[PDB]
Amino acid sequence: FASVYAWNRKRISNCVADYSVLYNSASFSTFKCYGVSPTKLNDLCFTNV
Amino acid sequence: GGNYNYLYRLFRKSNLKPFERDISTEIYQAGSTPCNGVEGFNCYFPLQS
Helix, strand or coil: CCCCCCCCCCCCCCCCCCCHHHHCCCCCCCCCCCCCCHHHHHHCCCCCC | CCCCCCCEECCCCCCCCCCCCCCCCCCECCCCCCCCCCCCCCCECCEEC
């Protein structure tokens, strides 16, 4: 991964991804989200990320 | 008035009936898989100052 001043972009769309398999994963130091309930992440549809 | 004597009850998943008394000042833990995959974690105080 690049430096903070040259942080890396990527565009993701037309996917079917599950966050539950990632939410329960314990290999993360911190996972806190703003205004979005993680358990409902599988019940929303977005244009892109 | 008290600087930290007023606190609110950050909670979800258990929508309550109208005019319901909620004095359950209990630590929010599940002790099962949907809390960091183990027992005793994601045990954060729902009460917030």
